[PDB]
Amino acid sequence: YGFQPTNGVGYQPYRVVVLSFELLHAPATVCGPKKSTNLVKNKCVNFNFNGLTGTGVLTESNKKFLPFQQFGRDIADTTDAVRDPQTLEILDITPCSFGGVSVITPGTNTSNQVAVLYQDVNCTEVNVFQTRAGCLIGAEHVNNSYECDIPIGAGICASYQTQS
Amino acid sequence: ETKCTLKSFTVEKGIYQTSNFRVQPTESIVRFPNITNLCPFGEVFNATRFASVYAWNRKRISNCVADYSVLYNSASFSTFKCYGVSPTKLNDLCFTNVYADSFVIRGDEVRQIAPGQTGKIADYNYKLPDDFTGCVIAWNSNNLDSKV
Amino acid sequence: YADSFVIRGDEVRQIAPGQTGKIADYNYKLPDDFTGCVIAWNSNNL
Amino acid sequence: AYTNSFTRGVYYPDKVFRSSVLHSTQDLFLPFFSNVTWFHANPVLPFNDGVYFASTEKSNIIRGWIFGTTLDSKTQSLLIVNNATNVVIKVCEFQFCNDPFLGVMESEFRVYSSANNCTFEYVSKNLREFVFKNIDGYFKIYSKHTPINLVRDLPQGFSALEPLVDLPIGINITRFQTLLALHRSAYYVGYLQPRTFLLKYNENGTITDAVDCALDPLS
Amino acid sequence: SSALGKLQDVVNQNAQALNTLVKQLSSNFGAISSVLNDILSRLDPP
Numbered sequence: 083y084g085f086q087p088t089n090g091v092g093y094q095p096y097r098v099v100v101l102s103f104e105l106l107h108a109p110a111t112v113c114g115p116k117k118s119t120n121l122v123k124n125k126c127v128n129f130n131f132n133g134l135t136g137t138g139v140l141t142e143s144n145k146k147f148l149p150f151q152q153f154g155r156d157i158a159d160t161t162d163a164v165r166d167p168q169t170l171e172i173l174d175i176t177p178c179s180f181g182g183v184s185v186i187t188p189g190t191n192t193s194n195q196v197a198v199l200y201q202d203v204n205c206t207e208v209n210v211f212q213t214r215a216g217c218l219i220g221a222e223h224v225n226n227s228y229e230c231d232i233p234i235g236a237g238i239c240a241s242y243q244t245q246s
Numbered sequence: 247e248t249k250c251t252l253k254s255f256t257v258e259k260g261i262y263q264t265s266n267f268r269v270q271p272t273e274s275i276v277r278f279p280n281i282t283n284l285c286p287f288g289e290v291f292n293a294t295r296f297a298s299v300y301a302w303n304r305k306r307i308s309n310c311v312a313d314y315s316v317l318y319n320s321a322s323f324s325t326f327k328c329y330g331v332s333p334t335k336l337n338d339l340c341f342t343n344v345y346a347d348s349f350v351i352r353g354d355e356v357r358q359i360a361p362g363q364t365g366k367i368a369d370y371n372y373k374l375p376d377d378f379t380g381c382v383i384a385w386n387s388n389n390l391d392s393k394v
Numbered sequence: 395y396a397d398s399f400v401i402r403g404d405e406v407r408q409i410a411p412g413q414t415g416k417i418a419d420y421n422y423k424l425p426d427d428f429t430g431c432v433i434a435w436n437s438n439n440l
Numbered sequence: 441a442y443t444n445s446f447t448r449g450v451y452y453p454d455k456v457f458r459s460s461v462l463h464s465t466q467d468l469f470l471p472f473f474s475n476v477t478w479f480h481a482n483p484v485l486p487f488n489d490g491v492y493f494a495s496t497e498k499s500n501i502i503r504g505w506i507f508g509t510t511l512d513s514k515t516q517s518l519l520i521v522n523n524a525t526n527v528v529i530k531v532c533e534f535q536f537c538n539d540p541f542l543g544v545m546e547s548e549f550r551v552y553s554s555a556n557n558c559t560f561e562y563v564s565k566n567l568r569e570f571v572f573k574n575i576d577g578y579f580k581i582y583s584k585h586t587p588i589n590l591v592r593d594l595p596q597g598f599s600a601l602e603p604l605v606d607l608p609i610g611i612n613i614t615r616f617q618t619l620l621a622l623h624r625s626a627y628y629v630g631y632l633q634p635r636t637f638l639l640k641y642n643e644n645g646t647i648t649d650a651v652d653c654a655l656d657p658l659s
Numbered sequence: 660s661s662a663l664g665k666l667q668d669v670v671n672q673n674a675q676a677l678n679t680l681v682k683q684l685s686s687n688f689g690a691i692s693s694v695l696n697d698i699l700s701r702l703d704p705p
């Protein structure tokens with residue numbers, strides 16, 4: 083090539099690179115770039131660790147995996163721990179609170195007031211009274227003991243007195 | 247809700263299961279491995295000694311973390327052509343190998359390089375196939391590679 | 395409802411209940427809960 | 441010679457941690473109380489479905505294996521080597537000596553005479569067990585290093601093997617060999633079959649015992 | 660202090676049934692996987 087700086091356009095050195103890809107056999111690919119995103123804590127989230135996909139709340143744990151072990155599971159084979167691939171720390175997985183809702187009625191032929199029980203839910207996640215059957219809203223906790231009227235559970239009952 | 251689930255305008259005293267309840271996911275998170283292998287791409291990027299056209303190089307590329315997303319957004323070249331998928335669809339894949347051949351040609355002949363072409367750099371000195379995957383990138387280097 | 399138009403001869407299978415394709419994904423869609431007939435006949439003589 | 445394994449060749453079959461439980465698996469294992477060949481110091485063996493491979497010494501006579509279908513050119517093969525430096529995995533088309541080895545001056549490596557078309561590279565008494573398997577283009581290698589208080593006889597006991605290397609080596613496999621360091625100045629081969637086992641997991645998550653469920657009526 | 664098998668058996672039966680119920684959440688019944696996030700990721704809605 084006869085090159086010179088006073089050459090016309092197109093008569094300039096153009097450095098060339100080409101790409102040529104391989105996709106025959108084998109599935110062991112190094113892939114390109116990912117894209118992490120730090121990590122919250124103590125909130126119901128949709129997580130994804132490497133392909134492990136689920137939803138729940140992640141806390142820090144007191145387990146100790148083996149250096150090659152990447153996640154844990156319990157009896158009934160549900161995932162209850164995980165290792166995150168950048169900190170090398172193992173995290174507990176807990177399902178995000180759920181339950182049933184029951185309404186306590188003194189009978190519509192007597193009143194329109196109701197109370198509500200959120201079954202086996204702590205009261206923070208919903209005057210307000212914590213039983214062993216769940217969180218109860220709209221009923222006053224008196225100190226006297228009557229015969230059972232409407233069974234709440236675990237030893238607690240409710241009733242329409244006097245008006246409330 | 248009681249009246250709906252009991253299908254009646256009157257209800258009698260009792261306790262009634264009416265619905266379920268559950269907490270909803272606040273957000274989404276993703277975790278993945280760092281890189282452990284930034285991979286090589288500078289040797290051919292920044293200044294460097296290139297070769298002739300029949301002395302076109304070759305490179306078996308081993309595992310590593312890609313970064314095309316930067317060369318795609320770079321666009322500081324005369325040429326960025328992939329006959330194959332868009333580079334938007336490229337930074338999210340997993341191949342076996344990519345091959346890198348390098349040489350320097352003139353500017354008035356780069357359009358001789360397309361899979362299926364003619365001329366002395368397509369007929370001689372180099373050869374593409376007709377079906378193609380990869381991308382071709384070229385840029386002028388007259389500032390450095392031409393001299394008085 | 396009579397929807398009347400003209401297409402390329404290839405994507406006549408693109409007018410169908412439930413599918414993916416450059417004609418079906420951008421210019422005309424039918425629900426998967428379709429109920430009706432589709433008629434096609436050739437035209438380069440008009 | 442032939443010898444009897446007792447409870448040998450158990451590997452962790454997945455990445456899953458497990459606390460104090462008894463977990464049942466179906467996989468390719470070395471059956472309990474098996475008929476394992478004995479070799480002294482070697483020849484071309486088969487592969488056919490995975491391989492158990494133990495070895496005993498204080499020096500290092502066992503210097504890796506070589507795998508493949510033809511162990512030559514015209515088809516691809518793997519090569520796993522270790523000079524006195526460190527491991528060298530490699531995948532080319534080779535030309536292998538029909539009796540390949542390395543010497544011990546300390547000059548060596550009469551192993552091959554060709555290294556064409558390389559598609560993968562890598563560089564960097566005692567009982568040393570290994571389990572080699574090859575599924576879906578992945579060549580998996582489990583291993584364990586236990587210290588014997590003998591020199592070169594197969595002992596008795598339980599010790600689970602932890603996964604190590606791994607890549608897309610693929611390269612169809614039907615045969616394999618061994619590599620030894622000559623004199624100039626003991627190893628076994630089991631095979632793996634599809635069995636069903638019952639693994640007992642510790643509270644730290646290690647496999648401490650197992651049951652082969654096709655040995656006898658009690659099992 | 661050194662016999663309550665009839666009470667132990669009703670506990671065992673209930674636990675053995677509740678475990679069989681959960682262990683069924685991981686069978687295909689003739690599908691491509693057992694996860695809905697895997698059929699909703701490599702299949703179109705139809």
Ligand SMILES: *[C@@H]1O[C@H](CO)[C@@H](O[C@@H]2O[C@H](CO)[C@@H](O)[C@H](O)[C@H]2NC(C)=O)[C@H](O)[C@H]1NC(C)=O
Nearest residue numbers: 118166167168169170171278279280281282283
């Ligand atoms: C991923 O990369 C980060 C840095 O980009 C590494 O973070 C370091 O981790 C060590 C713990 O081993 C800490 O002592 C350092 O303070 C961290 N530095 C920074 C800047 O965060 C992390 O270890 C890497 N992890 C992997 C698996 O590669």
Ligand SMILES: *[C@@H]1O[C@H](CO)[C@@H](O[C@@H]2O[C@H](CO)[C@@H](O)[C@H](O)[C@H]2NC(C)=O)[C@H](O)[C@H]1NC(C)=O
Nearest residue numbers: 287288289290291292293294316317320321322
């Ligand atoms: C190639 O190397 C050069 C030199 O190391 C890099 O040039 C630097 O660019 C930054 C940002 O434009 C300037 O602030 C520096 O002054 C430059 N270097 C020098 C020595 O002046 C260049 O960024 C490199 N190319 C790439 C793609 O990374």
Ligand SMILES: *[C@@H]1O[C@H](CO)[C@@H](O)[C@H](O)[C@H]1NC(C)=O
Nearest residue numbers: 189190191192193256258259
């Ligand atoms: C229900 O209401 C009716 C109509 O007011 C009344 O006759 C009846 O006594 C009530 N039932 C009670 C109080 O149990």
Ligand SMILES: *[C@@H]1O[C@H](CO)[C@@H](O)[C@H](O)[C@H]1NC(C)=O
Nearest residue numbers: 203204205206207212213214
């Ligand atoms: C409910 O949440 C509170 C707040 O952390 C906690 O102190 C308590 O132990 C939980 N359970 C009950 C039964 O109150």
Ligand SMILES: *[C@@H]1O[C@H](CO)[C@@H](O)[C@H](O)[C@H]1NC(C)=O
Nearest residue numbers: 209211222223224225226227
């Ligand atoms: C109920 O009695 C207990 C006595 O231990 C007392 O501490 C509590 O305050 C009482 N609650 C009400 C609402 O009177």
Ligand SMILES: *[C@@H]1O[C@H](CO)[C@@H](O)[C@H](O)[C@H]1NC(C)=O
Nearest residue numbers: 442443444473474475476477
């Ligand atoms: C192993 O099989 C060979 C095959 O002939 C047999 O001779 C030998 O006795 C067997 N060994 C054991 C321990 O069963």
Ligand SMILES: *[C@@H]1O[C@H](CO)[C@@H](O)[C@H](O)[C@H]1NC(C)=O
Nearest residue numbers: 521522523524525526528563
């Ligand atoms: C060990 O063997 C490998 C095999 O190629 C070689 O690359 C390496 O250089 C050898 N070690 C030394 C110190 O030469």
Ligand SMILES: *[C@@H]1O[C@H](CO)[C@@H](O)[C@H](O)[C@H]1NC(C)=O
Nearest residue numbers: 513514532533555556557558
């Ligand atoms: C493998 O090597 C042979 C001889 O060196 C060569 O003819 C052949 O082209 C090579 N394979 C490939 C895919 O280039």
Ligand SMILES: *[C@@H]1O[C@H](CO)[C@@H](O)[C@H](O)[C@H]1NC(C)=O
Nearest residue numbers: 107108509577610611612613
């Ligand atoms: C391995 O050999 C078999 C011979 O039956 C062949 O059919 C198969 O294609 C080979 N493997 C690959 C990945 O080509």
Ligand SMILES: *[C@@H]1O[C@H](CO)[C@@H](O)[C@H](O)[C@H]1NC(C)=O
Nearest residue numbers: 146641642643644645646648
């Ligand atoms: C491992 O297990 C042993 C015995 O099962 C236990 O004592 C120890 O705390 C565990 N954890 C270690 C050694 O980190």
